[PDB]
């Protein structure tokens, strides 16, 4: 029951896909692969078809391909991007070389929509609510997004939102250098590798996003890692003795101690005119000590979301086994694992 594939030269490369996918139009390409928008005749949906580039060129890339596939296959939630289809023109493992991932084509991201723009409080409540709803689900599976930012949040005409572009491969040092949005939303503990981070880094990101939706401005637009740290400490105050101890690196800890101490600012005087409940939530999310930040599940129960919160309609995820992350395998082994995941894929209802 293998579909019939047809070939077409797109993105300077040959694309071989099932007949169901029509009107392929290149819309982007990265170091990870090329993407084409298409019309899926089987579902009637507009979709993004991503052809990975040399998915098995090294152990690192092979494991990354496997990682991304396992992750997309697991995500089954309204506010998270899921996998509509995955296919390969290969008819056997020996012939297996290419991987195509198919997902919902999302109109645009939060970035290309609210850029230099301030949204109403009701609008912010709905958007942040959906992000936290997707995040409760994600974290419940012990998965950390690690790269939440406006450009990784898709929204349709009805303001329905989906989280995407999970952190699969560590960004390059150059990618996080300077006045770049790629770093403005990162929690300080991970921006400067202070300690073994956890799911709480994602809540810091939500806080930065939320503040930007409310003000129309980037909360911490640092020109470099240090400038950014100063912008952050200026708002939330410098680390106390309790947090200092939790910082593994002696170097980091030592640099921190060189800074003049500063008290946490009054957020009501920072986010002027903002809903007091919004201010309160921001203070709970933008906490320097990650151990003390509010969790997604806790945040959903915060009064700011009274209008949308429904404890019976904020599902958690099935257990997600990521023991493979510690597996030491050869390229071909990662490739065979990916192959099994491709052929065992079951279309969503
Ligand atoms: Mg992205
Ligand atoms: Mg519903």
């Amino acid at each position: 029951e293998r579909p019939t594939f047809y070939r077409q030269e797109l993105n300077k490369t040959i694309w071989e896909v099932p007949e169901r996918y029509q009107n392929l139009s290149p819309v982007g390409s990265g170091a990870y692969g090329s993407v084409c928008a298409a019309f899926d005749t089987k579902t009637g949906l507009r979709v993004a078809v991503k052809k990975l580039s040399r998915p098995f060129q090294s152990i690192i890339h092979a494991k990354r391909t496997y990682r991304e596939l396992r992750l997309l296959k697991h995500m089954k939630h309204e506010n998270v991007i899921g996998l509509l289809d995955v296919f390969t023109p290969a008819r056997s493992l020996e012939e297996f070389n290419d991987v195509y991932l198919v997902t919902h084509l999302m109109g645009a991201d939060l970035n290309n929509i609210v850029k230099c723009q301030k949204l109403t409080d009701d609008h912010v409540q709905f958007l942040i609510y959906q992000i936290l709803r997707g995040l409760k689900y994600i974290h419940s599976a012990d998965i950390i997004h690690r790269d939440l930012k406006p450009s990784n949040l898709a929204v349709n005409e009805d303001s329905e939102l989906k989280i995407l572009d999970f952190g699969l491969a560590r960004h390059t040092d150059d990618e996080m250098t300077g006045y770049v949005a790629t770093r403005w939303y990162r929690a300080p503990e991970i921006m400067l590798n202070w300690m073994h981070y956890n799911q709480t880094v994602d809540i810091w990101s939500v806080g930065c996003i939320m503040a930007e939706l409310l003000t129309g401005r980037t909360l911490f637009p640092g020109t470099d890692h240090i400038d950014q740290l100063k912008l952050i400490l200026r708002l939330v105050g410098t680390p106390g003795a309790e947090l200092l101890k939790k910082i593994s690196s002696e170097s980091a800890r030592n640099y921190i101690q060189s800074l003049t101490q500063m008290p946490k600012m009054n957020f009501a005087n920072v986010f002027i005119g903002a809903n007091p409940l919004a201010v309160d939530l921001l203070e709970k999310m933008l906490v320097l000590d990650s151990d003390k930040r509010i969790t997604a599940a806790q945040a959903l129960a915060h009064a700011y979301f009274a209008q949308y919160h429904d404890p019976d309609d904020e599902p958690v995820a099935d257990p997600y086994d990521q023991s493979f992350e510690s597996r030491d395998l050869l390229i071909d082994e990662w490739k065979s694992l990916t192959y099994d995941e491709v052929i065992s894929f079951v279309p969503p209802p």
Side-chain angles (χ1 to χ4, degrees), residues 140 154 215 242 247 265 279 285 289 320 349:
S140 73
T215 69
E242 184 179 340
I247 294 169
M265 292 177 80
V279 170
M285 296 178 294
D289 186 342
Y320 176 68

Side-chain angles (χ1 to χ4, degrees), residues 46-50 72 81-85 101-105:
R46 296 297 303 188
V47 301
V49 184
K50 183 207 296 189
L72 293 165
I81 185 179
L83 192 61
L84 289 174
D85 187 29
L101 300 167
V102 185
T103 52
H104 280 118
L105 185 71

